[PDB]
Amino acid sequence: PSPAQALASYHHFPTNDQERWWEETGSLFSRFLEAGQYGLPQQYQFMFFFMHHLIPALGPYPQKWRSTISRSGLPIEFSLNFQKGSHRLLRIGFEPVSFLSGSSQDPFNRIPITDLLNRLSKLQLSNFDTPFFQHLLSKFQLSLSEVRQLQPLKSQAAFGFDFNPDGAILVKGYVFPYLKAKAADVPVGTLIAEAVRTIDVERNQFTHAFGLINDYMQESTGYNEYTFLSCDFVETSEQRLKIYGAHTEVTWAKIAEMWTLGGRLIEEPEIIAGLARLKQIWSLLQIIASPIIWNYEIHPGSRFPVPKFYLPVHGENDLHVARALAQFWDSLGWPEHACAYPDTLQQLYPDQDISQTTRLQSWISYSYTAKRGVYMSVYYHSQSTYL
Amino acid sequence: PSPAQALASYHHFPTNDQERWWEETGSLFSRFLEAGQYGLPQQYQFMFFFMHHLIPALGPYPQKWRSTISRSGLPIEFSLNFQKGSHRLLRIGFEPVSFLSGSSQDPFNRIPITDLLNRLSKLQLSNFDTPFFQHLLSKFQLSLSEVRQLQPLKSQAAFGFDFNPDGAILVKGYVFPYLKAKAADVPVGTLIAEAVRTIDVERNQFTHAFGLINDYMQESTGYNEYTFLSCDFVETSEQRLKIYGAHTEVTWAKIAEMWTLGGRLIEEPEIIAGLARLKQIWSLLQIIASPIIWNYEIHPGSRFPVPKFYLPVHGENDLHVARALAQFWDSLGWPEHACAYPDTLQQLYPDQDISQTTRLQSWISYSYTAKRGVYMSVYYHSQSTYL
Amino acid sequence: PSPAQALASYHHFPTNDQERWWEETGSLFSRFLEAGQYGLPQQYQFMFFFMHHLIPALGPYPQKWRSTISRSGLPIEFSLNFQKGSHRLLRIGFEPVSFLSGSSQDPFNRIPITDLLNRLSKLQLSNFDTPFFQHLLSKFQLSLSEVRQLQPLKSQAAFGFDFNPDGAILVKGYVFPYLKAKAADVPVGTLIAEAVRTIDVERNQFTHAFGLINDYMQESTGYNEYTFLSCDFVETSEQRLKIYGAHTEVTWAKIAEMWTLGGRLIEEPEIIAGLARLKQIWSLLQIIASPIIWNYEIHPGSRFPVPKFYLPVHGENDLHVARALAQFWDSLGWPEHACAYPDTLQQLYPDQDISQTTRLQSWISYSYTAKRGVYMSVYYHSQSTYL
Amino acid sequence: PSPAQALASYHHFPTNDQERWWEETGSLFSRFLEAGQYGLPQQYQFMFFFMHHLIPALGPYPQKWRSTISRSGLPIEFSLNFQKGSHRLLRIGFEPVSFLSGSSQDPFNRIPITDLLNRLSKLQLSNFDTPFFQHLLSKFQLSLSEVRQLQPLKSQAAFGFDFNPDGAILVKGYVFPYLKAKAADVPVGTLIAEAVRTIDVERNQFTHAFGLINDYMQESTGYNEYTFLSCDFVETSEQRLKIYGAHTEVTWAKIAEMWTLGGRLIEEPEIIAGLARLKQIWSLLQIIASPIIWNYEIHPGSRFPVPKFYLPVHGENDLHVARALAQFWDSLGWPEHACAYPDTLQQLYPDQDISQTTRLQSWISYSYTAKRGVYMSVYYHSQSTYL
Ligand SMILES: O=C1N[C@@H](Cc2c[nH]c3ccccc23)C(=O)N2CCC[C@@H]12
Ligand SMILES: O=C1N[C@@H](Cc2c[nH]c3ccccc23)C(=O)N2CCC[C@@H]12
Ligand SMILES: O=C1N[C@@H](Cc2c[nH]c3ccccc23)C(=O)N2CCC[C@@H]12
Ligand SMILES: O=C1N[C@@H](Cc2c[nH]c3ccccc23)C(=O)N2CCC[C@@H]12
Ligand SMILES: CC(C)=CCSP(=O)(O)OP(=O)(O)O
Ligand SMILES: CC(C)=CCSP(=O)(O)OP(=O)(O)O
Ligand SMILES: CC(C)=CCSP(=O)(O)OP(=O)(O)O
Ligand SMILES: CC(C)=CCSP(=O)(O)OP(=O)(O)O
C-alpha cells in the first residue's frame, strides 16, 4: 500500500465535510507524493500540510460550488512536472471554498481566498510576501458591482502549490479579471494593461515584455473572457507574472503564430527551437469541446516573454496519451522518465484500467528554455470517484 | 448594578487572555452602553458583538504591544458623541492584536488587522464594502521593507466602531503611513498625495478638496510623522475620507490658522461661526506633554473640507473639565446633556472620585455644521485599572 | 414580532448545520421564552445559552439520528409547567448529537453526552455537581458489549433544562438502561435495583422508597424495555431520583392501580386527593399507537414515592385538548392560566391553525402535592416544520 | 540533527502557551523517539499525536499548577523501558492542565481530565474502552467535598501513554484517592478496598490477589497519603490493575519484606529469583529526600500480584548511574543495550554534561517475570531547561 496516509490514523477530522474530502482525495494525494519520488520525511511533511490547510478549505463535501480552475469544477487538481532526468515534482491548484461560497453573503467566493491567505502568512514560510498579490486583488474587487453582477464561471482568484524536492512549498496565486471587467463593461485587456501599468511606476520592469504581449493580443483578438492572470508569492525581483488566455479553435499555423507571438520574437533562437519540439508532440498527441490554453511568462529582467501551451487530453485515450507521451521522452533522451511512465500512471489509478479510460489525464503543458530544456507538466483527474 | 453584562453568566471565555480582558473592560463597556441611552435589546445586541469579536482581538491580557491609538497604548478606547438634544452615541476605536504582534513573525501587527477584517465580512452587516480600505492597505504594505525597518509607534492600521441608536454598527478604518514612508525615505504627504491620486482615476472626487489641504500642509510644514489617514467601510459615494495630523505647540492664532486652513476657506460662512463657538470652549477648558490633533474630512461631493480638532484633557482635573464642558452646553442650549453630564461621568467611574481624578477623560473633538450644529465627542479612560 | 431572537443579528453560526437548526428552532424557542412570561433580560440570558450550547449540540441538520426522547425522534422538545397562579416555566429535553452519532466510531451516541457535560461544568452554574450522574453512567457503559449489540431505540442518555424565573438554569439528566440490560441478558430491574443499591452504601436514603417501587414493578410486570431513569445535577441532599416506565394498554383501574402503586400508599391522604383530580382530567381528555408513561419520584428524606403520569395528546385535536385543558384550570381555580391559554397556544403556532392540528401538543404530565398543589406540564411540537 | 520535529515547519501553534511548550519539550520528545529505535514512519506518527493532543493539554507555559506525577511538578515525564534484547519502548506520563486548573472553577483539576479523555475516544484507537476507568473516577469525585477541602498534592488523575513498536498507542490511566479519603475522613485503603470490591460483583477476579495485598498493607501500615491506583484502557479481560505506594525510609530487609509482601508469596519461585537480581542492582546504585515507591500488579486471571519498585536516582550522579546501570545489563547478558547506553544518555542531553549532572534521570523501575524476564524502565528530566 501507499505510505504517507499513515498520519490520519491518529487524527480526527472535525467536520463530516472534511472527512468526506479526505476519503475522496486522501489516498490519491499520497500516491502522487510517492510518484513524485519525494523523500519519505518530505512526504509526511507535505502530507501534514495538505490535511491541515487544504482539507478544511475544500468546503462542503457534496460540493455546491464549481471552481473555474478544473474542467469538472472541483476545487483541486494535481500536477506532475517532468524535467531532464533530474526527476518529477508535484503541483496542486487550489480554490478555497466554504458553505458561504456562492451564497448571498459571498456570491463570488472572495472570503475563503482571504482566509486561506492568512493561514499561509501565519505559517513560517521561506520568502513569502503578499504585497504584489494584494495589489492585483485590490485592482479587481467589486462592492456595489456585486449587485450589478448578481443580475458561467464565477471564481475570482485561485492558489497553486509547488512542492520542490527540498522540504519547501512555494505558493502561486491566480486572479480572474473577467468579473471585474464585465461589471464595468470595459475590455479585459484595457484594465489588465492598466493593472500591469499601475505596478509599473511601482516598478517598470514588465512594461517592455507585456506591451509586447498586449500588442499581439490586440492584433489577434486574443483577449477574451477566458484570459486571466497569475503571479508568485515573493519579493518582486524574483517574481514571474504570467498572462493566460484561450482559443476555441486553433490550427498548427495559429499555434505557430501564437508561439512566436505573431512574428514579434522570431529573432530569439530559443523560440524557434521550442516550437520545433512542440510540433513533434502536436503530431504524436492528436494523431462542445475543450479549448486550448496559452501562457506568456514575463520574467522581469528579460526583454521577451516565454510561452507555454496547454493541450487537451481528456477525451483522448489516456493510454494512447501515455504511450505517445513516452515516445516523446526518448526523442528528447530521458532514460528513466519514458521507460517507467505508463507504469507510473496505472500505479496512480489502480482502481481504473487505462485501456478504456479517457478523463484520467486532462492537460499537458509545454515550455522551452535554453537553460532548462523542456518544461512539461501533466494535469490529472484529481479525485477518487470517476464517472 | 449595570445590566448588559448579564450575558456573561452563561458564557465561557476560551482563553485566560480573554477572561482577563473581560474583567478589565467588560463592566466598563456595559456602563457606556447605559450612558448612551441605548434600547435594552440593542445593549445586549452590541454587548453580544463586543464579546465575540473584540475580546478575542485584544490579545494577551498582560499586553505586550503598545497601540498607536491610545495615549496609554492599549488597543481600545470608548467614545461618546453628543448632539443637539437628539441624544448621545457610543464609539469604539480598535487595533486588533495577537501574541505574534511585535514578534519576528509579524513585527508591525499586520496579521490581526486582516483577520478581524474577515470576521466582519462574514457577519451579515448592512452596506459593508472593503475595496476602498483594501486599496489604501495595498498602498502601504512593506515586505522586504520590514527587514530594513527592524533595524516609536509601530501600528499600521486600526478600526473604529460607531453604534448608532438603531441596532446597526458602522465600521471605520484607519491607516498609518508613517511606516511605509519611513522605509522608502519619502515624505509622508508625497505618498499620501500620490495615494489619494491613485484613487482619483479610480474616481476624481477628492482631488479638489485634498489638493486644497495638501497645499496648506506644505505651506505650514503641517505634515509630520504623526499624520495619518481615515475612511469609512461603505460604497465610495457615501464615503468620507479624512486626513489627521498633530502639532507640538499651538497657539490660538495657530488654531485659527488651521481651522481656516490658512485662509483657504474664509469664504464659507460656516467656518467663521464654528470657529466662534470653538474659542468659547478653548477659553473654558485650558483656563513632555500631549499634542493637539486636527482632522480634515473630505466628503466627496463637496468642494471644501470640514475641520475637526481634538483637545487634550488628560492632565486637566476631570471635574473641572466636566464643569466647563457642561456650561458650554447651556450656551448652546442643550437642556438635558448639560444638566445631567457630571452625574453621568461619575456613574461611569464609581470606583473613582472625580474631585481628584485627571486621566479619566482624554480628548474632546469639535466639528461644526450648518445642518448638524455642533459635533462634539469625548474620549475616555477605557480600562478599569487606573494608576 | 417575537423579541429574543434579535441576538442572532450580529452572530455568525460557524457551520451550515447550526444555521439550519437555528432557522428550524430559533424563532420557536424565542416564543416559548415569551410565553413563559420571563423577564426580558432573562429571555436574552437564556436565549444566549440556547445559541452557544444547544445549537452546536444538535448536529447535522438533515438529522441522521433518531433520539429516544421525542415521539418524532428529534433531539429536542420544549415543555411548559403550569402552577397555581404563580406563572409558568420553560423546560427543554435535550440529547446531544454529532455526525459520529450512529456510526462505527460511536454507534450508540455516548460521545456527545460527555462533550456537552464538560461545557456545562465549564459554565459557572449554581449548585452544579456531577457525581451522582457519573455514577449512573459508569454503571451502564458497554465496551465489548457494543460489539455484541451491533449484531429499536438506541440512545443511552439525555439532558433536561429547567429555566426558572430567576436567571438560573437547572440541569436534569436521564439514563436509558435498556441497552446495558439487553447486552448482559439481565432483566432491567435487577440491574436497576443493583444500581440503586450500589448507591445505598453510598447513602441508603433511597432503599425504602425504591424497594417499595421495585416490589410493585415485579408484582405487575411493570418493568419493560421502555423503563428508564432520571436525576438532578446537584448535591445528593437536594436530589430527586425518578424511575419512569410505560404501559401499552391501560384502563382507569390500571391507572388507579399504578397511582396507588397497587395499594402501597393508600395510607397517604395526598394520593387519594391527587387521584380524584386526576380522573377529572382523564374524563375531559380522551372523551400502532402511543403508550402512556408513569413516573415515581424518590425524594431521599421522605418514605413514599410521589407519582406522575404522562398522557398522549398527539392524536387528539390540539384544540379539543386546549379547551378541555383550560376547563380543568377553572375547576382548580387558576384565573389567568385558564382564560388566556388557547390564545397562548395559537401565539406559539401562528403558522398552523389549531382548528385542524393534532401533533402540536403531545404529552401532559400530572403530579399532586399537599404543598405545591397540582403540577402539570405540556410537551409540544418543538420544530418549525410540521408534516 | 534529530528528525521527527520536521513536522513543525508547516504547522502553526494557535496559542503562545502551546508554542512555549513546544519549544520546551519538542526536541526532547523527538530525541526519545530516536532513542527508542522507532520506525521513521512511526516516529512521525507519534510525533503527530504529540503535537495535536498533548501540547494543547499542557496549559499555560509558565505553569501555574504542580502536577503530582513529577518530582519537579511539571505535568509530563518521558520513560524508556528496556527489555531482553528486543529493544526499548518510550513511555509518557501525562496530567492535562488548563488555566482553570487550580482556580475557583476547578480547584483540583478534574476538567482537563475529562476533556482529554474525549479527544482520545474520538480518535479511532484499537481496543479502547473506558468503562473500567470511568468506574474508578466516579468512586472518587467530590462535590460539596470540594468546599470542605478548599478549607500538598492536589491532582486527582493522570494519563500514561505507551507507544509500542507497531504504530499503536496504549493508554494508561491513574487515579489519586487521597483527596476523596481526606474529605470523608476515611482511611485510604478502606475505600480503595471498597472500590475494588465494588468491581468484584462487577467481576470478582481481583478479590483474591487484592485481599492478599490489603492484608500486608494493614499489617505493615503500608497505606498512606501517597497510595494511589492505576489501570489500563481496555476490555476487562486484558486489564491489569495496579496499586502503588511509598515509604519514607526503607532498608534492604524492608525491601525484601515488601517484595515478598511479608511472606505471602515466598512459595512462588519467580519472586525469589526476581528478588535476587533486585539486590544486585540495589548494591550497584546507592553504593528532606525522595521516597521509594512500590507497585503490585493484579492481573485478573492469576492468583498472586506481581511487584515492581521505583528507585530514586535524582540526587545520584547520572553518570555513576549510567555506569552501574550498564554493568547490570551485562550481568543479565544484554549485548547492545549495555554497550551503547551512556552514549545513548548523552545523545538525549547534548546540552548537558553527564560528568556533573544529577537530575537528568529520576527513577528506575524493576519488575520480574518468568516469561518476560527483567522489566526495567528509566524516568528522565522531561523538559529542556535544567536548573
Ligand atoms: O476549462 C478550464 N480549465 C482551467 C485550467 C486550470 C486548471 N487548473 C488551474 C489552476 C489555476 C488556473 C487555471 C487552471 C482554466 O484555466 N479555465 C479558464 C476557463 C475555463 C477553465
Ligand atoms: O497620542 C496619540 N493618540 C492617538 C489618538 C487616537 C485615539 N484613538 C484612535 C483611533 C484611531 C486613530 C487614532 C486614535 C493618535 O492618533 N496618535 C497619533 C500619534 C500619537 C497618538
Ligand atoms: O415515545 C417516547 N417518548 C419519550 C418521552 C420523552 C420526551 N422527552 C423526554 C426527555 C427525556 C426522557 C424522555 C422523554 C420517552 O420517554 N420514550 C420511551 C420509549 C418511547 C419514547
Ligand atoms: O514524587 C512523586 N513522584 C510521582 C512518580 C510519578 C512519575 N510519573 C508518574 C505518572 C503517574 C503516576 C505517578 C508518577 C509519584 O507517584 N508521587 C506520589 C507522591 C509524590 C510523587
Ligand atoms: C490549465 C491552466 C490554464 C493552467 C495550469 S497552471 P501551471 O501548472 O502551468 O503553473 P506553472 O507552470 O507552474 O507556472
Ligand atoms: C484622537 C484622534 C487622533 C482621533 C480620534 S478618531 P474620531 O473619533 O475623531 O472619528 P470620527 O470623528 O467619528 O470620524
Ligand atoms: C415524556 C416523559 C416520558 C418524560 C418527561 S421528563 P420531566 O419533564 O417530567 O422531568 P420533571 O418532571 O421536570 O422532573
Ligand atoms: C514513578 C512512579 C510512582 C510510577 C511510574 S508509572 P510506570 O512507568 O511504572 O507504568 P508501567 O510500569 O508501564 O505500568
Side-chain angles (χ1 to χ4, degrees), chain C residues 105 110-111 114-115 118 121-122 124 129-131 134-135 138 141-144 180 194 201 235, chain D residues 105 110-111 114-115 118 121-122 124 129-131 134-135 138 141-144 180 194 201-202 235:
Chain C
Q105 292 181 359
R110 183 173 190 267
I111 299 297
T114 61
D115 288 331
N118 279 319
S121 62
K122 293 178 183 178
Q124 56 190 359
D129 285 331
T130 61
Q134 292 296 118
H135 185 78
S138 182
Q141 304 192 11
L142 288 74
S143 68
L144 306 186
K180 179 73 172 179
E194 213 279 334
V201 298
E235 158 52 19
Chain D
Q105 295 181 356
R110 183 177 190 270
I111 303 300
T114 59
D115 287 333
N118 278 322
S121 62
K122 288 177 186 176
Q124 57 194 357
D129 286 331
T130 59
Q134 290 296 117
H135 184 74
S138 185
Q141 297 191 7
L142 287 75
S143 68
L144 305 188
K180 180 77 169 181
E194 213 282 335
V201 298
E202 178 58 13
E235 158 51 20

Side-chain angles (χ1 to χ4, degrees), chain A residues 79 91 162 172 174 228 242 244 293 308 310 363 379:
Chain A
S79 301
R91 291 172 181 253
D162 282 335
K172 191 183 295 177
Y174 298 94
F228 67 91
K242 299 196 282 192
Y244 307 23
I293 297 94
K308 182 181 289 183
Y310 298 91
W363 298 105
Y379 299 91

Side-chain angles (χ1 to χ4, degrees), chain A residues 141-199:
Chain A
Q141 299 191 8
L142 285 75
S143 70
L144 304 186
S145 299
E146 285 181 349
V147 182
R148 184 77 281 281
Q149 256 295 241
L150 283 169
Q151 186 58 257
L153 297 76
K154 296 181 178 184
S155 66
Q156 187 174 348
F159 284 145
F161 295 98
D162 282 335
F163 303 106
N164 78 14
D166 185 1
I169 297 95
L170 281 69
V171 180
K172 191 183 295 177
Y174 298 94
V175 171
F176 296 85
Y178 174 68
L179 286 304
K180 183 72 170 177
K182 180 69 175 66
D185 186 70
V186 172
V188 184
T190 53
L191 55 82
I192 296 171
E194 213 280 333
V196 182
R197 184 183 67 82
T198 56
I199 193 72

Side-chain angles (χ1 to χ4, degrees), chain C residues 63-80:
Chain C
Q63 62 176 350
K64 302 170 186 176
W65 175 264
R66 283 186 182 267
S67 179
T68 300
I69 68 168
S70 176
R71 184 81 200 284
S72 71
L74 67 88
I76 193 167
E77 80 173 3
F78 305 101
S79 306
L80 289 168

Side-chain angles (χ1 to χ4, degrees), chain A residues 19-78:
Chain A
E19 180 64 30
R20 289 170 185 170
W21 281 109
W22 174 260
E23 193 168 1
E24 189 67 20
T25 73
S27 296
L28 189 61
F29 178 75
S30 180
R31 294 200 293 270
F32 290 12
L33 295 171
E34 191 181 3
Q37 293 176 354
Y38 287 95
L40 190 64
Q42 293 79 246
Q43 299 199 6
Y44 289 153
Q45 194 176 4
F46 307 125
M47 187 63 214
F48 189 84
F49 177 84
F50 180 83
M51 296 185 290
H52 283 83
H53 297 84
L54 305 185
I55 296 295
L58 290 178
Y61 168 69
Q63 70 177 355
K64 322 186 223 179
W65 173 264
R66 286 184 180 270
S67 180
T68 301
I69 70 168
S70 178
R71 185 82 200 287
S72 64
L74 68 86
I76 195 166
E77 79 172 5
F78 302 107

Side-chain angles (χ1 to χ4, degrees), chain A residues 216-342:
Chain A
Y216 175 70
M217 296 305 293
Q218 289 178 353
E219 293 178 356
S220 58
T221 303
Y223 286 157
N224 56 1
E225 56 187 358
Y226 299 109
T227 184
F228 67 91
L229 193 62
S230 170
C231 68
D232 291 337
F233 283 92
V234 63
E235 158 53 20
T236 62
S237 174
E238 286 76 1
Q239 183 162 2
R240 294 191 291 262
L241 81 86
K242 299 196 282 192
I243 293 89
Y244 307 23
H247 266 84
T248 179
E249 285 177 349
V250 65
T251 63
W252 174 253
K254 182 72 173 178
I255 294 169
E257 174 174 352
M258 295 189 286
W259 183 269
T260 57
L261 197 59
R264 303 287 181 181
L265 72 166
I266 41 82
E267 302 176 357
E268 284 294 334
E270 295 176 353
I271 292 86
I272 307 164
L275 197 158
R277 294 290 189 183
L278 191 155
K279 186 174 180 296
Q280 276 188 12
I281 309 165
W282 203 83
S283 65
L284 289 172
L285 275 292
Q286 187 55 253
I287 194 166
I288 300 88
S290 65
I292 89 91
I293 297 94
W294 49 259
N295 177 1
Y296 294 101
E297 180 175 355
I298 300 167
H299 173 72
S302 175
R303 287 185 73 89
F304 61 72
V306 178
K308 182 181 289 183
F309 288 176
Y310 298 91
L311 307 182
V313 176
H314 58 273
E316 292 288 326
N317 181 356
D318 292 331
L319 178 54
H320 175 73
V321 177
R323 298 285 181 86
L325 197 282
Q327 295 177 357
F328 179 76
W329 304 120
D330 282 329
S331 296
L332 292 172
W334 297 359
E336 184 62 25
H337 312 239
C339 298
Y341 175 73

